[PDB]
């Protein structure tokens, strides 16, 4: 439905990157699936995937102390707990469900920083995603740059790797945790969730970055049958551009028509 996505692009003065995979049949929908976009906060879902490979459920109860030096531009949860700290579990919850930036950075430091995250992503077969920076500097991507970018195809592949039993890069109890957090996300109601059919469940992670970049990646489940994994990425021509979540919801509707 290439002309359908081109028409949407034009309506929102934007560029789309789309990949969706029905995991039951391998039917795919693609539109610029290999084009780089700033991944923005979608990287938080993969960072937690790596945290979960490396830590036991019990070890997620370790309390992490931090200070106001760890606070960055957007700290909705972490700003409330400077005095006591937060557990790794609580930081993952804040990162995934509120897109708390300091939470992502603390988790990233626990796993060894952006170079360690990159190594672990390469180990699962993601040759594309390029972690380089912490939040919020990772949102400052000029189009054409490869630092802190990925593609729709690569983000779907990696998200599927952590979240689903096939290929299963997490054990079951840990998969369940990641899915539960993503299902309870608070930031995505106007994105992929707004473009799926009645009765579909959604586990998503959003992001927004320079050049009006607006992304959502998700696992979606029909009332019965196999899940779809999809990424809807977008950006715009001008550095200070705004975004419109409706572009992602409408692109999701086109994907769903194509799949069903």
């Amino acid at each position, epitope marked *: 439905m290439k002309d359908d996505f081109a028409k949407l692009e034009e309506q929102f003065d934007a560029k789309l990157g789309i990949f969706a995979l029905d995991t039951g049949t391998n039917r795919t929908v693609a539109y610029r699936p290999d084009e780089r976009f700033a991944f923005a906060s979608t990287i938080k879902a993969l960072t937690v995937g790596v945290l979960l490979q490396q830590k036991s459920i019990e070890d997620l109860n370790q309390r992490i*102390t931090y200070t106001r*030096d760890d606070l960055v531009n957007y700290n909705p949860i972490t700003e409330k707990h400077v005095d006591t700290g937060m557990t790794l579990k609580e930081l993952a919850d804040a990162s995934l469900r509120y897109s708390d930036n300091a939470a992502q950075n603390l988790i990233l430091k626990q796993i060894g*920083g952006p170079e360690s995250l990159k190594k672990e992503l390469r180990k699962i077969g993601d040759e594309v995603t390029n972690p380089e920076r912490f939040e919020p500097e990772l949102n400052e991507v000029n189009p054409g740059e490869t630092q802190d970018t990925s593609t729709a195809r690569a983000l779907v592949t990696s998200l599927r790797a952590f979240a689903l039993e096939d290929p299963g890069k997490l054990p079951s109890e840990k998969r369940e945790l990641l899915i539960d957090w993503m299902k309870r996300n608070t930031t995505g109601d106007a994105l992929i969730r707004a473009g799926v059919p009645d009765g579909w469940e959604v586990a998503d992670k959003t992001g927004a970055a320079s050049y009006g970049t607006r992304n959502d990646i998700a696992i979606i489940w029909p009332p019965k049958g196999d899940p779809v994994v999809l990424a809807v990425l977008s950006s715009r021509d001008k550095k200070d551009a705004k975004y419109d979540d409706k572009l992602i919801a409408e692109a999701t509707k086109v994907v769903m028509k194509a799949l069903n």
Partner: nanobody
Framework: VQLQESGGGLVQPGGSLRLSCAASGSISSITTMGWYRQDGRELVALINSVGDTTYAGSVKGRFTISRDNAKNTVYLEMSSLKPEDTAVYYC??????????????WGQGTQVTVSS
């Protein structure tokens, strides 16, 4: 556990400095250690326990971070300093202690002033 900084001060444009940051106390392990500055707030350089480095785009090729795991100490060598590098630089280490505490710890900050 604490972080001790040293090495700041005033230098002329073009000059150089080395900052050091040493962790002390009952330390079990350290993941990332490195340097931030406030002009706003930005990472300057980070190095992990297996020697992987991250540098701010504006300093790469001029500043070198290194680490001595055995001594829990990180060093930031700064060369070809510019007036735009004038800032408070402050050290961060993500550490675990033998008492079972883990967290992001910070040094006191060190002024570097670059001026004729």
């Amino acid at each position: 556990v604490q972080l001790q900084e040293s090495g700041g001060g005033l230098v002329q444009p073009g000059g150089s400095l080395r900052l050091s940051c040493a962790a002390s106390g009952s330390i079990s392990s350290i993941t990332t250690m490195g340097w931030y500055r406030q002009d706003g707030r930005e990472l300057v350089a980070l190095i992990n326990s297996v020697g992987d480095t991250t540098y701010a785009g504006s300093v790469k090729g001029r500043f070198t971070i290194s680490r001595d795991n055995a001594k829990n100490t990180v060093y930031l060598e700064m060369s070809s300093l510019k007036p735009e590098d004038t800032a408070v630089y402050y050290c961060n280490a993500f550490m675990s202690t033998n008492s079972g505490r883990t967290g992001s710890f910070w040094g006191q900050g060190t002024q570097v002033t670059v001026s004729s």
